[PDB]
Design a protein. Structure first.
Length: 202
């Protein structure tokens, strides 16, 4: 059955790595389900992010399915980190009332997995990270129109980022995450590797 957590931690569940974090404001429940699945609920949350994926990110055909709901500022994104350089990155497929990162630091565009994304770079100064209190860039691909479920071919994003001088370091984790900020909502997301699909043919 499910395992529902409310405090920040990482682990492996159903065969998949997961990461979950919250600041402890408001309410959030992160429920680990069979295989690549998790569900979540949040109510008037301060901030949280979490999902299932890979302990070591990289070039991958990520595949995910499920549902994502919010009345406020929440988003659904492949979410991960590198070190040397320290980078926090996002490939955002859907959001609520606020399209991240509010247009800040626009760099260009990329086409991947059937859709156009806008590319941004933002900066975090003296901020908590996977390597402690640091100054680091955040890289974003944000879909021009919302999508919930599909493939995210990470290499296409990384390569576009690189074309704009947004270079990555050594991969740390990479998860298909739900995020909330001063908002309420729910999600139900199942992650998989997309490489076992039939060959595309039209």
């Amino acid at each position: 059955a499910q395992q529902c957590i409310t405090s920040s931690q990482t682990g492996n569940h159903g065969g998949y790595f997961y990461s979950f974090w919250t600041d402890g404001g408001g309410s959030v429940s992160f429920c680990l389900q069979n295989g690549g699945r998790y569900t979540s609920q949040w109510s008037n949350v301060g901030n949280w992010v979490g999902g299932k994926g890979w302990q070591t990110g990289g070039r991958r055909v990520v595949s995910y399915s499920g549902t994502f709901n919010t009345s406020g500022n929440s988003y659904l994104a492949l979410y991960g980190w590198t070190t040397n350089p320290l980078v926090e990155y996002y490939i955002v497929d859907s959001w609520g009332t606020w399209r991240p990162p509010g247009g800040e630091g626009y760099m260009g565009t990329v086409f991947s997995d059937g859709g156009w994304y806008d590319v941004y770079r933002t900066q975090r100064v003296n901020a908590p990270s996977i390597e402690g209190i640091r100054t680091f860039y955040q890289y974003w691909s944000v879909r021009q129109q919302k999508r919930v479920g599909g493939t995210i071919t990470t290499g296409n994003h990384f390569d576009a980022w690189a074309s704009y001088g947004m270079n990555l370091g050594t991969h740390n984790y990479m998860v298909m995450a739900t995020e909330g900020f001063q908002s309420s909502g729910s999600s139900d997301i199942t992650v998989s590797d997309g490489g076992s699909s039939s060959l595309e043919h039209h």
